Amino acid sequence: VKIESVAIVGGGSSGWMTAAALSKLCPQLEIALIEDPNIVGESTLGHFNKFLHLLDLKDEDWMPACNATYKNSIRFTNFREGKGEVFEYPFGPSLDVSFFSQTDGINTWGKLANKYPEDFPPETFARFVNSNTYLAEHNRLTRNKDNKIPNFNFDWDTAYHIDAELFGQYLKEKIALPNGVKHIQGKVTGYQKESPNNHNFKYIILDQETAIFADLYIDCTGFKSLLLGEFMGEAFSPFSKKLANDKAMATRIPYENREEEMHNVTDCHAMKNGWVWNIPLWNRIGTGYCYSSRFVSKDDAEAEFREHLGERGKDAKIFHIDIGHGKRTRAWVNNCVGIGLSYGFIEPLESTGLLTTHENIENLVYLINQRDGYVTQAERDGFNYTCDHQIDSFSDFVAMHYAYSMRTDTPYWKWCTQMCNYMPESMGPHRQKQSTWQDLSTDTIGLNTWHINHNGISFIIAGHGLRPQSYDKLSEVLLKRNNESDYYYEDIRKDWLKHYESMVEYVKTLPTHYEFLRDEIYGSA
Amino acid sequence: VKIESVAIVGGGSSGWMTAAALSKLCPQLEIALIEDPNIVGESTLGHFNKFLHLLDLKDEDWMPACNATYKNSIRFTNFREGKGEVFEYPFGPSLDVSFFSQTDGINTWGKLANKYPEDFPPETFARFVNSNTYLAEHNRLTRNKDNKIPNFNFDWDTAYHIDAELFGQYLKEKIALPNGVKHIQGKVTGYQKESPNNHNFKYIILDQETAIFADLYIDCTGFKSLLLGEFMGEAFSPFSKKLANDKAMATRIPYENREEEMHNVTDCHAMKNGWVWNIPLWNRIGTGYCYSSRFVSKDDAEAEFREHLGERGKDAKIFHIDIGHGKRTRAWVNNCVGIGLSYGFIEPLESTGLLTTHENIENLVYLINQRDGYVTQAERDGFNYTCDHQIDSFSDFVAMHYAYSMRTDTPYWKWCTQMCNYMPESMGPHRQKQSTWQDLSTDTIGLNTWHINHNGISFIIAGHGLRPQSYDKLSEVLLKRNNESDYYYEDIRKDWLKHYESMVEYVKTLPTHYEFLRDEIYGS
Amino acid sequence: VKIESVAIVGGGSSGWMTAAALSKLCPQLEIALIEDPNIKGESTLGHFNKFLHLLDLKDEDWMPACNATYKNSIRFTNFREGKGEVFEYPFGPSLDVSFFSQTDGINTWGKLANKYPEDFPPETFARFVNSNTYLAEHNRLTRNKDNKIPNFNFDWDTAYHIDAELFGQYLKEKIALPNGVKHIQGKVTGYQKESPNNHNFKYIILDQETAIFADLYIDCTGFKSLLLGEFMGEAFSPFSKKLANDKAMATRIPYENREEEMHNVTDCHAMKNGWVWNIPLWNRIGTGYCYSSRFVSKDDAEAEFREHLGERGKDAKIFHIDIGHGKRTRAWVNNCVGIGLSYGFIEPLESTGLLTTHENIENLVYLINQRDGYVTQAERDGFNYTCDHQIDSFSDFVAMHYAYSMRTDTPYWKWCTQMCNYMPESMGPHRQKQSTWQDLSTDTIGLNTWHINHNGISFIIAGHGLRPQSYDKLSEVLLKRNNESDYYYEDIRKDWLKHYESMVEYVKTLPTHYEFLRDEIY
Structure with a gap:
C-alpha cells in the first residue's frame, strides 16, 4: 500500500523541483526521474521563497546558475485605460497602516483620492500602503538591515526572475542526483493497468521495451499531460468562461x-x-x-x-x-499525480506559472512525511480539494484584472469589461466556494468599504481607478452621526506628501537592481 | 462607453428622488425626467436620514412642504395573539447593553422574563434595550442635547411620516429643476433596440412620435415596470411562497x-x-x-x-x-435600471416602501461617481447582486412577523403560522445565501441563545413571546459546571424597574410629538 | 392549536426518558405512554449529565438501580494499524492549554512529536491536552475536590455505562408515573388521518379497537419506526455511503x-x-x-x-x-415526532446511542415551554433542521475514525482507507452544510494547522498518527518570516515529561474505578 518508490516522468523545472524536494524532504523514498534526451524566462511569487527555504538554497549559490534576477513587484502598463498608465502590485505580507486614519483604516487612501485628486492618482495607493513600491519604481534594492524601508523583509518580500530549465539543471546537479535520484534517459511510450477494473499503473513502458515499476507515478510532462490526462484519462476544465486567452x-x-x-x-x-x-x-x-x-x-x-x-x-x-488554460478535474488519480502544467495552468498575469508546481510538491511532501509514505483516499481527496480550491481562487483573481478595466477600445476589451458575466452563480440560492466576486461587490457597492481580506484585489481595483467611497459627500454623511470632522486629512496629506518626497530621495541613494546583483550575488557580469 | 446622459421615466417620489440625487451628487450627468400629465402617506426607515443628509435637506424646510411628522418606532398591535397586545421595533444604532449581565449579554432580558414573568412581559424587551421606546410609548420628542435619553441620536434615530407625492414635488422645485433636470411632459409609448444582437435601447418613443436619446434609462414607472419588465422583458419573482398579501x-x-x-x-x-x-x-x-x-x-x-x-x-x-409583491430577477438589464416599484416591493410592515428606491439610487450614484460615469458589466452584476440580496433579506424579515405569530383564529393566520414552510431549501446539502431562518433556528433551539447579528429579529420574536432560553431550569443547569450563581439578577431586576419608573417620569416632562412639531418645525 | 396532551408510543429508555422529561419540565402537559406487553448495556456522552441535571438525578440514587458504572474516555484499541495500539478520546470541556507554545497553540504537541518522536508517540496527544486521560489509562477515579487533576470536573467530565432498560424502568417508577404519566398497555395496530388534505393523526388505534386521542404523538418504537416511518410514511436516508456497518x-x-x-x-x-x-x-x-x-x-x-x-x-x-444506520428525512412530520431509533441511529463508535434521544427530548421541551405548548411550523422546521444537522455532523465524525486508519489488511479496511470517497460534493461550486472533511483538508494540507474548532477530530487523527505539520523542516521555515525560534521546545519537552512522570505517580495514589463505585455509590 505505502509509497516507497516514486517515478517522475518529465525533466523540466517541474520534474527536478519534484525530484530535489522529495530526495531532500522524503529521504525514505527511492526516486527515479524519466527524461527524454531528444527534446525560457519565468517570474515567481513570494510562495517560491518557502520552496527555496525548505531546500536551504541561498540566493548567492543558485541565482547565477540560472541567470536569475530579483523581483519586488508586478507592474501593469496599459491595463486601466490603454494610454501607457502604470500601477504596481508590490510584494508584502500586509498593508503598511502607518498613515491610515484610526477610524477609516484601509479606506484612508480612497478619502485622500476624493479630497486631493491631483496629489493621489491611482498609482499612489501602492506607494501609500507598501514601500517595496519605491524599490520597484526606482529600480533599487537593499537588505533593509536597518528597517529604513518600512514593512519590507528582503528574504520574503523579494521574489525572482529565473530561467526555469537552468533552475531545474541546478536542482539536478546539486540536490537530486547527489541524494541518489536515479536519472533514466528514455521516452515513455505506453502503460499497463493492474487489471480491467484496477486502474492503477502496474508499470509504464520506456521506448516500447522497458517497464518502470513505482508505487507512485508523478506527471511532470507539461501540457502533454501524458500520464494524468492521456493514460489515466482525467478530463480538463478550461477557464474560457472568465479568461479568453487560449x-x-x-x-x-x-x-x-x-x-x-x-x-x-x-x-x-x-x-x-x-x-x-x-x-x-x-x-x-x-x-x-x-x-x-x-x-x-x-x-x-x-x-x-x-x-x-x-x-x-x-x-x-x-x-x-x-496553452492548457484550465485544470484537470483531479490532480491525484489512482497511483498518478499531476505536478505543473500536466495538472493546471493560469496565464502568468499574476506570475502564477510555478504555483501549480511548488504547491502540489509541498502538499505531496506533507502527506508522504505524515506516516512514512502511507496515505488514505481521504488525504488524496483532500490534496485534490486543496489544490483545486487554489487554482480556482487564482483564476478568479486573474479574471478581475480584465473585468474592472476601463478599456473598450477593441472587441477583446469590450468582451472583457462589458459582455462577460463573472458572477453567473451569484443570483442562485446557494453560497459559492469561490465567492470573492460576490464579497467584493457587497463590500464596495453594499458597505462602501475595503478590507485587508482583499489581499491583492485592493492593488488591482485601486490601479483601475476604483475607491471604497466613490465621492467625498458620502464620507461626510457617515461622520455626521457622532459629530466628527475630516479636517485631520489636511495633515495626513501634507505629512504623507513630505514622507514620499524624502522616501524617493533616500531610495535614490540605494544601489540599483543591477549594481546589487553584481556586488551581492554575481560578483561580475 | 460612459453614462453621460440619463432619461428617468416616471415622476412620483421615485422619479424625483432619483432626479434630485443624480442632479446634486452626479453633476457631470445631463438628466431628463419624462412624466405623463394624465397620471399618499407612507413611513420611512433610518436609511432615509442618509438620503436627506446626502441632499443637505433640513427638517425645518422640507417637512411642512409635505405634511411630514416624526417617527421613533414601528408599533405592532394585535400581531402576537389577536387580543390588542402591543410591542415596538424602535429605531436605534445598537442594543443599549447598560443593564446586561456581563456573562449573558443579549440573553439577560430573557432570563429576567423567566425569573420575574409579572415584571418582564414581552413589551419590556424593547424598553430594556432601547430608550427611543419611551419617546414612542409616551408620544414625546426631544433633540436629547444632554444625552438624558440613553443611546438616542435625534437626527439619525428619528425617521419620518411623509406624503410621498408632495415630497417628490419638493425635490422637483428645490433640487432637481434648479440643477437643470429637463422636465419632459409625455407618455412613453414604445422603444427601439440598437441592433438585432445589441438589446440596449437606442431611444424610447414619446406619444408615438418623439425619440428620447440617453446613455442610461431609469424605470420609475412603479408597478407598471414599463421599461424593465415590459420593454426589456425582465421576469418577476413573486414572494407569494412566504408573503400571502397581494x-x-x-x-x-x-x-x-x-x-x-x-x-x-x-x-x-x-x-x-x-x-x-x-x-x-x-x-x-x-x-x-x-x-x-x-x-x-x-x-x-x-x-x-x-x-x-x-x-x-x-x-x-x-x-x-x-401590489407587485416581489422583485424582477435583475434591476440593471442592458442600459435600463429599475428604481422603486418597477424593480421590487415588500408590503410596508417594516416601513420598507422607499427601500427599493433610495438603496438603488445610492448604489447607482456610487457606480456613476466611481470613474466619471464609466461602469463595467462586473459592477452592474454587483449592483444586481447587492440589491437582490437586500430585498430577499428584508422579505424574509417581514415573513418572520407572520411565521412566529400565535394567531390561528382565521384560515389566513392558520396558513401563516401552521401550514406555510419558510425554510424549504434548509434540508438540502448546500448553504443558502439567505439563511436567517436556518441560523435563528440553530441559535434558539440548538444553542439556546440570541445574538446582536439578529438586528431587528430580536424585537419581533420577543414581542411574539419567545425567549432565548424558554425555561429557567435550563439556565440554572449551565451555571452548575463551575458552581456559578444568578443571585445578581435580583439586583438587575430592582435596579432596572427603578430606572424604568424614573425614565417614564423624565419622558413625561418632554414635549409631545405635536408640541415639538408645532414649536420646532411648523409654527401652526 | 397548542400541544396540551401527548401520546408516547414505545416504553424503552427512549419512551420513559421522554415521559419523565415532559412530565417534570412540562407540567402543563397531559401525558400517556403506550407500551406493548408482548415486546420482551450502553455508554453515554458528557451531554447525558445535562439530562441527569435537568431531571435532578443524583449518581447515588439511579446508578445502582441499573448496574451503572463510570466512564472517563472512549478507548480505541487496534484502530490505527491493527497491532494492539491504543489511543483515547477522553471527556473534557476544552483542550488544556497549560504546556502549549503561546505562538503554536494546539500545534505544540505535533512539533514535539516531530522533534522528539521517541518521547511523543500518538498516545501522548491526549495526555498532553487532557488529564482525564490519566484516570482512564490507570483505571482510577476522584471527585478532584482540590483541582490536582487539571481541567477535570467529576460531575460533568465523567459520563456513565448503563443498562438502558433498567434506566427507563427507574425514570418510570421515580419520575414519570408519580407525575401522572398514564401507562396504557396495548399494541398500536393502525391510525386515522384528519381528512384527505389534513395528514395529522386524528387518533391511533390500540388492539384494532381503542382510539387514543393526543395533540402530539411521539414515536419511541425504535427501528420499527411505526408512527414516523410506517404510518406518516417518512423516507429513510441510509449512511452506507460513508459507514459500511449494517x-x-x-x-x-x-x-x-x-x-x-x-x-x-x-x-x-x-x-x-x-x-x-x-x-x-x-x-x-x-x-x-x-x-x-x-x-x-x-x-x-x-x-x-x-x-x-x-x-x-x-x-x-x-x-x-x-440496525437502521441512517436517519428519516424529517423527525417532526405533521403531529408526530421521532425520538430515538425511530428517527435515526449512528453505530455507537462515539457512544452516540442516546444522542438521537436526549437532544430531540431537550429540543421538544424547549419548544413546548416557549408559549405554553404553542408551536409554529417555523419552529417544527427549525427542530428538523437542528436535529438533522447534528446526526449528519456525528455520522461524518464517526466516518473519520475509519477514513484515516492505516489498516489495509482486509478488504473491509482496504475499502474504508483506500477506496471510499468521503468528500464527493467537495469538487462542486457550492458550499456544503456539512463541510468538516473539506475544512480539515484545508486546515491540514492547505494551512498546516489544527484548530480548537476540531473539538474531537484532533484526538482521532492524532491517534491515527497524523500531525498538523508532518515534518520539522516545515515548522522551521514558517518561523523564518518573523525571525522566530523553537529553542524553548527543549524546555517544553523536559518540563512536560517531568509533569507526566509525577502525574502518573499521583494518579496511582487514587482509588480504582471499582473501589470508587464500591465506597461512593454501592
Whole structure:
C-alpha cells in the first residue's frame, strides 16, 4: 500500500523541483526521474521563497546558475485605460497602516483620492500602503538591515526572475542526483493497468521495451499531460468562461542598455487581444503575448507583438505554445499525480506559472512525511480539494484584472469589461466556494468599504481607478452621526506628501537592481 | 462607453428622488425626467436620514412642504395573539447593553422574563434595550442635547411620516429643476433596440412620435415596470411562497383629537386576512389594509377595514391598489435600471416602501461617481447582486412577523403560522445565501441563545413571546459546571424597574410629538 | 392549536426518558405512554449529565438501580494499524492549554512529536491536552475536590455505562408515573388521518379497537419506526455511503476478575470487518460486533467475535440486530415526532446511542415551554433542521475514525482507507452544510494547522498518527518570516515529561474505578 518508490516522468523545472524536494524532504523514498534526451524566462511569487527555504538554497549559490534576477513587484502598463498608465502590485505580507486614519483604516487612501485628486492618482495607493513600491519604481534594492524601508523583509518580500530549465539543471546537479535520484534517459511510450477494473499503473513502458515499476507515478510532462490526462484519462476544465486567452507566443530579446533595462519587476503590458510579459534575466529579456484566438489570428497577434517590441521585434525568434488554460478535474488519480502544467495552468498575469508546481510538491511532501509514505483516499481527496480550491481562487483573481478595466477600445476589451458575466452563480440560492466576486461587490457597492481580506484585489481595483467611497459627500454623511470632522486629512496629506518626497530621495541613494546583483550575488557580469 | 446622459421615466417620489440625487451628487450627468400629465402617506426607515443628509435637506424646510411628522418606532398591535397586545421595533444604532449581565449579554432580558414573568412581559424587551421606546410609548420628542435619553441620536434615530407625492414635488422645485433636470411632459409609448444582437435601447418613443436619446434609462414607472419588465422583458419573482398579501386598499381619515392622535409611530394592526397601517401626517391619518385575495374578497376586506376605522370608516374614500409583491430577477438589464416599484416591493410592515428606491439610487450614484460615469458589466452584476440580496433579506424579515405569530383564529393566520414552510431549501446539502431562518433556528433551539447579528429579529420574536432560553431550569443547569450563581439578577431586576419608573417620569416632562412639531418645525 | 396532551408510543429508555422529561419540565402537559406487553448495556456522552441535571438525578440514587458504572474516555484499541495500539478520546470541556507554545497553540504537541518522536508517540496527544486521560489509562477515579487533576470536573467530565432498560424502568417508577404519566398497555395496530388534505393523526388505534386521542404523538418504537416511518410514511436516508456497518451482534459476558476488568472506559476494538464495543457494568460486561454484511457472512462474523472474546466466547448467548444506520428525512412530520431509533441511529463508535434521544427530548421541551405548548411550523422546521444537522455532523465524525486508519489488511479496511470517497460534493461550486472533511483538508494540507474548532477530530487523527505539520523542516521555515525560534521546545519537552512522570505517580495514589463505585455509590 505505502509509497516507497516514486517515478517522475518529465525533466523540466517541474520534474527536478519534484525530484530535489522529495530526495531532500522524503529521504525514505527511492526516486527515479524519466527524461527524454531528444527534446525560457519565468517570474515567481513570494510562495517560491518557502520552496527555496525548505531546500536551504541561498540566493548567492543558485541565482547565477540560472541567470536569475530579483523581483519586488508586478507592474501593469496599459491595463486601466490603454494610454501607457502604470500601477504596481508590490510584494508584502500586509498593508503598511502607518498613515491610515484610526477610524477609516484601509479606506484612508480612497478619502485622500476624493479630497486631493491631483496629489493621489491611482498609482499612489501602492506607494501609500507598501514601500517595496519605491524599490520597484526606482529600480533599487537593499537588505533593509536597518528597517529604513518600512514593512519590507528582503528574504520574503523579494521574489525572482529565473530561467526555469537552468533552475531545474541546478536542482539536478546539486540536490537530486547527489541524494541518489536515479536519472533514466528514455521516452515513455505506453502503460499497463493492474487489471480491467484496477486502474492503477502496474508499470509504464520506456521506448516500447522497458517497464518502470513505482508505487507512485508523478506527471511532470507539461501540457502533454501524458500520464494524468492521456493514460489515466482525467478530463480538463478550461477557464474560457472568465479568461479568453487560449494562445501564447514567446521570444528572447537582447538588452540594449542592460543596467537601465534589467528591472526589479515583471511588467505586464495590455495589448489589443491580451497582454505581453517582460521578464528581465541576467543575460536577456524574456517576453511573450498571451492572446485570444476568439478575437485575433496567429499572424495578426505576431505582427502586433513584433510592432510592440520595436526594432528587436523584427529578428526575434518567436515560439507559439498551445496553452492548457484550465485544470484537470483531479490532480491525484489512482497511483498518478499531476505536478505543473500536466495538472493546471493560469496565464502568468499574476506570475502564477510555478504555483501549480511548488504547491502540489509541498502538499505531496506533507502527506508522504505524515506516516512514512502511507496515505488514505481521504488525504488524496483532500490534496485534490486543496489544490483545486487554489487554482480556482487564482483564476478568479486573474479574471478581475480584465473585468474592472476601463478599456473598450477593441472587441477583446469590450468582451472583457462589458459582455462577460463573472458572477453567473451569484443570483442562485446557494453560497459559492469561490465567492470573492460576490464579497467584493457587497463590500464596495453594499458597505462602501475595503478590507485587508482583499489581499491583492485592493492593488488591482485601486490601479483601475476604483475607491471604497466613490465621492467625498458620502464620507461626510457617515461622520455626521457622532459629530466628527475630516479636517485631520489636511495633515495626513501634507505629512504623507513630505514622507514620499524624502522616501524617493533616500531610495535614490540605494544601489540599483543591477549594481546589487553584481556586488551581492554575481560578483561580475 | 460612459453614462453621460440619463432619461428617468416616471415622476412620483421615485422619479424625483432619483432626479434630485443624480442632479446634486452626479453633476457631470445631463438628466431628463419624462412624466405623463394624465397620471399618499407612507413611513420611512433610518436609511432615509442618509438620503436627506446626502441632499443637505433640513427638517425645518422640507417637512411642512409635505405634511411630514416624526417617527421613533414601528408599533405592532394585535400581531402576537389577536387580543390588542402591543410591542415596538424602535429605531436605534445598537442594543443599549447598560443593564446586561456581563456573562449573558443579549440573553439577560430573557432570563429576567423567566425569573420575574409579572415584571418582564414581552413589551419590556424593547424598553430594556432601547430608550427611543419611551419617546414612542409616551408620544414625546426631544433633540436629547444632554444625552438624558440613553443611546438616542435625534437626527439619525428619528425617521419620518411623509406624503410621498408632495415630497417628490419638493425635490422637483428645490433640487432637481434648479440643477437643470429637463422636465419632459409625455407618455412613453414604445422603444427601439440598437441592433438585432445589441438589446440596449437606442431611444424610447414619446406619444408615438418623439425619440428620447440617453446613455442610461431609469424605470420609475412603479408597478407598471414599463421599461424593465415590459420593454426589456425582465421576469418577476413573486414572494407569494412566504408573503400571502397581494392587495392593498388605502384611505385618508381626518383627526378627531389631532394633538392626542398624531403619534410618534407607524402602528401596524393585524386583521383577519392581513394588517392595517396607521401613518399620522400633519393634516390627516393615512391608513390602509394589506390583505391576501387568496383568503378574502375585496368587498369583505373593505367591510373589515371600515368596521376597524369606526365612525370615520363609513364616509372614507378608499383606493384599491394591485401590489407587485416581489422583485424582477435583475434591476440593471442592458442600459435600463429599475428604481422603486418597477424593480421590487415588500408590503410596508417594516416601513420598507422607499427601500427599493433610495438603496438603488445610492448604489447607482456610487457606480456613476466611481470613474466619471464609466461602469463595467462586473459592477452592474454587483449592483444586481447587492440589491437582490437586500430585498430577499428584508422579505424574509417581514415573513418572520407572520411565521412566529400565535394567531390561528382565521384560515389566513392558520396558513401563516401552521401550514406555510419558510425554510424549504434548509434540508438540502448546500448553504443558502439567505439563511436567517436556518441560523435563528440553530441559535434558539440548538444553542439556546440570541445574538446582536439578529438586528431587528430580536424585537419581533420577543414581542411574539419567545425567549432565548424558554425555561429557567435550563439556565440554572449551565451555571452548575463551575458552581456559578444568578443571585445578581435580583439586583438587575430592582435596579432596572427603578430606572424604568424614573425614565417614564423624565419622558413625561418632554414635549409631545405635536408640541415639538408645532414649536420646532411648523409654527401652526 | 397548542400541544396540551401527548401520546408516547414505545416504553424503552427512549419512551420513559421522554415521559419523565415532559412530565417534570412540562407540567402543563397531559401525558400517556403506550407500551406493548408482548415486546420482551450502553455508554453515554458528557451531554447525558445535562439530562441527569435537568431531571435532578443524583449518581447515588439511579446508578445502582441499573448496574451503572463510570466512564472517563472512549478507548480505541487496534484502530490505527491493527497491532494492539491504543489511543483515547477522553471527556473534557476544552483542550488544556497549560504546556502549549503561546505562538503554536494546539500545534505544540505535533512539533514535539516531530522533534522528539521517541518521547511523543500518538498516545501522548491526549495526555498532553487532557488529564482525564490519566484516570482512564490507570483505571482510577476522584471527585478532584482540590483541582490536582487539571481541567477535570467529576460531575460533568465523567459520563456513565448503563443498562438502558433498567434506566427507563427507574425514570418510570421515580419520575414519570408519580407525575401522572398514564401507562396504557396495548399494541398500536393502525391510525386515522384528519381528512384527505389534513395528514395529522386524528387518533391511533390500540388492539384494532381503542382510539387514543393526543395533540402530539411521539414515536419511541425504535427501528420499527411505526408512527414516523410506517404510518406518516417518512423516507429513510441510509449512511452506507460513508459507514459500511449494517449489522450488529451483542452479548453479555461474566467478569473473570471484576475489580481489574470493570474499566473507567468504553473500549472499541477494531476487527477484520468492523469493531467490538466493551461496556463494563456492575454485574457483567456488555459486548457486541458492529460489522458489514458486504464484507463478511453472519457465521464468519460470529466465529470472529467468539474467538476475540476468548473462553467466555464459546457459551455466550449472541443476539443479532438489523440496525437502521441512517436517519428519516424529517423527525417532526405533521403531529408526530421521532425520538430515538425511530428517527435515526449512528453505530455507537462515539457512544452516540442516546444522542438521537436526549437532544430531540431537550429540543421538544424547549419548544413546548416557549408559549405554553404553542408551536409554529417555523419552529417544527427549525427542530428538523437542528436535529438533522447534528446526526449528519456525528455520522461524518464517526466516518473519520475509519477514513484515516492505516489498516489495509482486509478488504473491509482496504475499502474504508483506500477506496471510499468521503468528500464527493467537495469538487462542486457550492458550499456544503456539512463541510468538516473539506475544512480539515484545508486546515491540514492547505494551512498546516489544527484548530480548537476540531473539538474531537484532533484526538482521532492524532491517534491515527497524523500531525498538523508532518515534518520539522516545515515548522522551521514558517518561523523564518518573523525571525522566530523553537529553542524553548527543549524546555517544553523536559518540563512536560517531568509533569507526566509525577502525574502518573499521583494518579496511582487514587482509588480504582471499582473501589470508587464500591465506597461512593454501592
